[PDB]
């Protein structure tokens, strides 16, 4: 079975909905997308394994393999997209449309195009002639939980020489980014009429005490840790949303705060959890049982690719570009547990998750070239 | 799309290209050259076919891709030796597989090498190579080496390195001795044996020359050494002698046929001057009477330096260390252009033999060798 031309591959991927969401009604299975990729890889002569990802709403990972033995190259991407706002799109998000040197569609930039590029570059490559293995990972639920990548990293026996995750980086090689933890702090107070405030426990007052401690943690993070390579050098902590209480004339019976932290590479999740628990401890100990912490998504550590890796040397030379760091988060921390990993892909973060998302056609040739060249270097040598 | 390997090979074997000094058995290699030229053009090479001056309608082919300095030369001859039809048991020009062998004239020596180059190149995109690749196909290796001689005299190409795909069982050969064969001819002056003084006795003059030539033999054995060779010195052989009509006549003429096999590093000019120096007392005593004529075109010894990168690369790919051999190839002429190895599939033991073959076990390792050396010397 011959592989369709690049634009047809791209078009079919965009046309196959794969939105992930916390809300079940918006959370679409990536079964169709995964099978489409899996059979294209099978057609090119890869061994392909599709696995259900435990704990997801019917989502799957795909790993396509050619070759056996140590090392080789892993090319990795996620299959899901974010949802779309049909108020703000002006085209069908599932219809790949070329206009004014741009290819529009949901996931054109983030990040279905990367798979089209891989397949198109492999069009004629005889995988029987490779000397080291080539692996392609397609993951579930990157945009929500990262359960696909986490599950793969937890279970796989593979240890490649190196990996590239094709997130949109404008084909600039990214070697590090911050982590991401997002929590809801929930405080249960006691109701009562405002004519006698002392008679109950006021959840806003307790949340005030808690926020004091959380802001002291924010200050300590910022005072203690700095990596000026990041445009924001410190670990960040953001108070995003707060809600509680019925009415002005009633003791506030509950209050919830949603916050996040973006730790620098090198801080462990265990460390950071300890620092948050320590921060809240004075409140939890004064008011036993009343304060709880929930995660809004599973936590993700920061990451950094080590120096002096062939991957960097080769890619920097191929692109004429030095590695950069970013403040946002990817599956790289999970993949980096397996091998040295870069984040490198076509399209721009500026279009990711946006209405009328697109990928510029100018990325087509340089992306095809990069992929051909890294396969040659890491698999054909 | 090139035809599959076996069809390329069949086509080459099926196209007679026997070379011979006799005009009647000496076949043009034009048809063999045309097959290769058209296939290299199919692959996107620039192809030049040149007549080889002084031959019976023979040609050389050079297929070229890429621009600028260096690169890789792959070289072979297009001719074969003749066949003895009483000793063959299949048609020499019909490539036939039997029990892991491919039988036919030139299977081992050395048409297979071209089939392997074309087959290795079938999917290779030459437009992507960063340094040039050249394929040379020569005339008349098995007689005069006119093809290789002419190419080496005329080309401006200076590759980084070259391989000549003679059958070496895919073991790299980095040196061999030369070969010069001369007739020493002495003109005497006849007369009746009852009065020797009235003539000039060519056997007596030849006796003086032989003494000088055996002294040269002794000098060559004493003063030049190359340990790797089974006979580690330059050899000199007196093979044939003939002169005179009768016991009762002064011997009016005498001829001696001899050969010398010099070591790598001795030039033909150096060797010629040693021989001329040895003969000088005789030619000076008897001006006009002694001449030296070549019996075949002289071949210098050859070597590639053992530490060259081409040696390192091939020794690792093949798991076989470099060797030296006692017989001749075109390597001395190609070595004038660039460091050169002799390395190819099939065995020397099948070369020029009845029911010549190349074993099929050579197919996969030869394809891989060619692919790897093109990659190493041309790709980046
Ligand atoms: Zn993404
Ligand atoms: Zn995203
Ligand atoms: Zn290479
Ligand atoms: Zn030969
Ligand atoms: Zn021969």
Numbering used by the authors:
A (entry chain B): 3 to 383
B (entry chain A): 4 to 383
Original authors' sentences:
ArgE is a metallohydrolase in the arginine biosynthetic pathway that hydrolyzes N α-acetyl-L-ornithine to form acetate and L-ornithine. ArgE is present in all Gram-negative and in the majority of Gram-positive bacteria. The first critical step in bacteria is the acetylation of glutamate to form N-acetyl glutamate, and the second critical and unique step is the deacetylation of N α-acetyl-L-ornithine (NAO) by ArgE to form L-ornithine. Therefore ArgE is required for cell viability, making it an attractive antibiotic target.
The two structures show a dimeric protein present in the crystals which is likely to be the biologically active form, analogous to published data on the DapE protein (Nocek al., 2014). The protein monomers consist of two catalytic domains (residues 1–179 and 305–383) and a dimerization domain (residues 180–304), with a small hinge region connecting them. The zinc-binding sites are located on the surface of the catalytic domain within the crescent-shaped substrate-binding cavity, and the zincs are coordinated by H80, E169, D112, E145 and H355 residues. The first three residues (H80, E169, D112) bind Zn1, which is present in both structures, and the last three residues (D112, E145, H355) bind Zn2, so that D112 interacts with both metal ions. The occupancy of the second zinc ion in the di-zinc structure was less than 100% and was estimated to be 80% based on visual inspection of the difference maps and refinement of metal positions. The introduction of the second zinc may be due to differences in crystallization conditions such as salt concentration and pH, but the presence of Tris buffer appears to contribute to the binding of the second zinc ion into the protein within the crystals. The Tris molecule directly interacts with five protein residues (D112, E144, E145, E169, and H355) that are involved in zinc binding and also with both zinc ions. One of the Tris oxygens is positioned between the zinc ions and may stabilize the second zinc ion in the active site. Upon examining the crystallization buffer, the Tris concentration is 100 mM, thus acting as an inhibitor at this concentration. The Zn-Zn distance determined by X-ray crystallography was observed to be 3.38 Å, nearly identical to the Zn-Zn distance of 3.39 Å determined by X-ray absorption spectroscopy.
